[PDB]
Structure 1
Amino acid sequence: TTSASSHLNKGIKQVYMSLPQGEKVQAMYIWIDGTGEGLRCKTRTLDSEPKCVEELPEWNFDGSSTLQSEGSNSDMYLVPAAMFRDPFRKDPNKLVLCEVFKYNRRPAETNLRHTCKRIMDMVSNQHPWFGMEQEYTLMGTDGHPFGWPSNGFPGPQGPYYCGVGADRAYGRDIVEAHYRACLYAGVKIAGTNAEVMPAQWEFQIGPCEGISMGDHLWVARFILHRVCEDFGVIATFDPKPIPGNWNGAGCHTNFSTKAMREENGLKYIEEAIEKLSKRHQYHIRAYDPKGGLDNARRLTGFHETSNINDFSAGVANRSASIRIPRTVGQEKKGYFEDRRPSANCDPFSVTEALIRTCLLNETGDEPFQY
């Protein structure tokens, strides 16, 4: 059920990691591969500790091995974008999130941060804030959810949501380790809780301003993957890992601007929702790496989910595409929540689509070029 490498003696590794480092510094480069969902990592040595991301040098990798290029010139380039403290090796080591460029210096197909940053720069004065709730499921190496009976199912749902106990919460050690690691690294993690389906968990990232939302979410995903690798289990972001009566995984997003946060911002909130109501198909396309095929299995209308083909909104409505918190309605200001995005969505795409539809008043089936 667990990987072979997880059965090695970890005391030896701790003893080795207790050695003083010296004066060299390790930096780990992270980037998104050609599938648009996976991550790749790489390590290099630095003479001294960098103080800002601008001080890190550029690097490169073979694109033909990551399904990002082919032919005689498959080399690609990594440009640092964000820097965080390394929780697996501690200070002064660093984690670096990088953008991918082709040999001719054009952004790669899956490099969606390049356009998102430019779009965000156009509405900086409005100070858009974001918050996302990432749900995921822990799986064993055999493809079965962690802690489930062999070739079987646990009891019916109901006792696992926010549950406590050896028979209600599965793999809380991973959750605690991930929370502490994210706090140490500097990620803006807001909370966690156990979900309805056993072995399914959730963590919230935010509030984040502008482009930092995607950086924080991607770094959190990478940290979760590394922690699960340490424990020997697999973390999956599939929107519907188990068919049937079991719950799916979503990536609900909170959105607000300076106008909405101010008293009587409910008018702007309703204006934004009205604008969003006319681009349901476009947003559904932008909320899935596969263009919407994956989210179809999740958004069926059953359980507390909204149908994929229909748009709806309301106040304190958990079955609607867009939900307005009751507190926001009472205090006529705040934010609104979008419940459509899938668990394996790309935050850059979601934020860019929201900004384009709500603030830039874009219309049609394609994005503007500016």
Structure 2
Amino acid sequence: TTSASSHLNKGIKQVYMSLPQGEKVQAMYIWIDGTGEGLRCKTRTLDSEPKCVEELPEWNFDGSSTLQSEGSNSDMYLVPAAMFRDPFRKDPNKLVLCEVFKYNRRPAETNLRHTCKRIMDMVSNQHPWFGMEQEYTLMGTDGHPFGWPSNGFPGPQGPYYCGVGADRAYGRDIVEAHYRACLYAGVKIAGTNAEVMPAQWEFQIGPCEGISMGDHLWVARFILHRVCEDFGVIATFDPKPIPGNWNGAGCHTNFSTKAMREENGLKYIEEAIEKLSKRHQYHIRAYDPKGGLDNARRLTGFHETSNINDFSAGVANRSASIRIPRTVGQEKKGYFEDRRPSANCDPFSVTEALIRTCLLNETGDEPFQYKN
């Protein structure tokens, strides 16, 4: 079933949304809350359209309502970081992604962009590109996957992957709407496909340079939640939404530098993979908002997945931790794919770890403080 809000008359809402706006402009501020997984938002009115992110004012919120601050000193501060066009209200209104700071101006516990940005600036001449494949499952308000038989299961897997038809693909209206909204907003969405599990979907973001990878994915996540709210369904990024013989959800991360993209760049790809082979446990902890417990329910070495305990790598191997595409090996240049991150990973944490291990030559179980 769907939510009570989705049963309201949507034609009424569009009549009000058709009213000409006038001179004022709406800006929606978006930030990550104390769980490191959820998003929050609210709107303020501006006198004129902002042209760049630098001319948006700072804002604030009460951190005791988001489990981010204690009692006495509960005020937290929002600092705009990236701006996009608003697909839900249209031009000239904006979406604003913000960094969160405590009352004493130190970064919040779940503010991982502050450290990630400094790391990205250390290797800016190498031009790192990232590409992330975000998988998710559409859910009903009753906790069951959308379009599944009530208290039951659909047919066995096999016909749902990249499927077409009323009996093969569930919820394509959400997917189509999310795709168009991202393109309007300016998010670098690269494609979509239906997944092995019915009502499971995937969209790809990238290639993005540096810190902009995390900014684009978080805004894409927000747009998906807001679109699903209109239809009355829930999108979940849980790695294993359904137990048993049903496909899980991950966030594959593709990585490349300027050196790897040039001729005979496969040599630098092999060197990065060698460095990654020595830090398996460090990346497992960084690829999860809970230190790796979430990914354990998904990475068991079955259904085209790698083992949580073991590191493996190979060309055109979809059962390994790291996969080199057959085309990349054939042309001796390109990129490589990290298949370990879970679907609920923080992109800032994932991208920072890749830079530290591969480009800054860090060792040990702790990140090196200041420089590399």
TM-score, with length taken from structure 1: 1.00
Query: 1: distance between equivalents of 2:162 and 2:265?
Result: 33
* Aligned match of 2:30: 30
Secondary structure at 2:19 match in 1: coil
What does the per-residue CA deviation read over 1:232-255, in whole Å, with 9 as the maximum and x for residues that have no partner?
000000000000000000000000
Displacement after TM superposition at 1:9 (Å): 0.1
Give the superposed CA RMSD: 0.3
Displacement after TM superposition at 1:310 (Å): 0.1
Secondary structure at 1:182 match in 2: helix
Displacement after TM superposition at 1:186 (Å): 0.3
What does the per-residue CA deviation read over 1:108-159, in whole Å, with 9 as the maximum and x for residues that have no partner?
0000000000000000000000000000000000000000000000000000
What does the per-residue CA deviation read over 1:157-181, in whole Å, with 9 as the maximum and x for residues that have no partner?
0000000000000000000000000
Query: 2: distance between equivalents of 1:244 and 1:147?
Result: 19
What does the per-residue CA deviation read over 1:188-235, in whole Å, with 9 as the maximum and x for residues that have no partner?
000000000000000000000000000000000000000000000000
Displacement after TM superposition at 1:303 (Å): 1.1
Displacement after TM superposition at 1:323 (Å): 0.1
Query: 2: distance between equivalents of 1:302 and 1:122?
Result: 39
Query: 2: distance between equivalents of 1:272 and 1:244?
Result: 35
What does the per-residue CA deviation read over 1:273-330, in whole Å, with 9 as the maximum and x for residues that have no partner?
0000000000000000000000000000011000000000000000000000000000
Query: 2: distance between equivalents of 1:267 and 1:226?
Result: 43
* Aligned match of 1:117: 117
Query: 1: distance between equivalents of 2:221 and 2:91?
Result: 20
Paired residues, what number? Answer: 370
What does the per-residue CA deviation read over 1:29-66, in whole Å, with 9 as the maximum and x for residues that have no partner?
00000000000001000000000000000000000000
Matched, 1:68 2:90: no
Query: 1: distance between equivalents of 2:78 and 2:42?
Result: 11
TM-score, with length taken from structure 2: 0.99
Query: 2: distance between equivalents of 1:335 and 1:5?
Result: 44
Displacement after TM superposition at 1:71 (Å): 2.0
The 4+ residue runs of structure 1 with deviation greater than 6 A are none
* Aligned match of 1:296: 296
Query: 2: distance between equivalents of 1:51 and 1:184?
Result: 17
Query: 1: distance between equivalents of 2:39 and 2:269?
Result: 35
Query: 2: distance between equivalents of 1:264 and 1:275?
Result: 19
Secondary structure at 1:253 match in 2: strand
Query: 1: distance between equivalents of 2:180 and 2:303?
Result: 32
Secondary structure at 2:297 match in 1: helix
Displacement after TM superposition at 1:15 (Å): 0.2
Query: 2: distance between equivalents of 1:363 and 1:201?
Result: 36
Secondary structure at 1:298 match in 2: coil
* Aligned match of 1:43: 43
Query: 1: distance between equivalents of 2:303 and 2:96?
Result: 39
Query: 1: distance between equivalents of 2:289 and 2:132?
Result: 17
What does the per-residue CA deviation read over 1:46-91, in whole Å, with 9 as the maximum and x for residues that have no partner?
0000000000000000000001011201000000000000000000
Query: 1: distance between equivalents of 2:166 and 2:41?
Result: 35
Secondary structure at 1:252 match in 2: strand
Secondary structure at 1:328 match in 2: helix
Give % identity.
Answer: 100
Query: 2: distance between equivalents of 1:16 and 1:255?
Result: 45
Query: 2: distance between equivalents of 1:24 and 1:57?
Result: 15
Query: 1: distance between equivalents of 2:158 and 2:266?
Result: 35
Matched, 1:278 2:278: yes
Query: 2: distance between equivalents of 1:292 and 1:120?
Result: 24
Query: 1: distance between equivalents of 2:182 and 2:100?
Result: 24
Query: 2: distance between equivalents of 1:125 and 1:119?
Result: 12
Query: 2: distance between equivalents of 1:279 and 1:68?
Result: 31
Displacement after TM superposition at 1:18 (Å): 0.2
Query: 2: distance between equivalents of 1:227 and 1:303?
Result: 30
Secondary structure at 1:31 match in 2: strand
Query: 1: distance between equivalents of 2:22 and 2:70?
Result: 41
Displacement after TM superposition at 1:106 (Å): 0.3
Gaps of 5+ in 2: none
Secondary structure at 2:217 match in 1: helix
Displacement after TM superposition at 1:334 (Å): 0.3
Query: 1: distance between equivalents of 2:123 and 2:349?
Result: 16
Query: 2: distance between equivalents of 1:334 and 1:169?
Result: 33
Gaps of 5+ in 1: none
* Aligned match of 2:97: 97
Query: 2: distance between equivalents of 1:201 and 1:342?
Result: 15
1:94-173 alignment runs, 5 A limit: 94-173=94-173
Secondary structure at 2:201 match in 1: strand
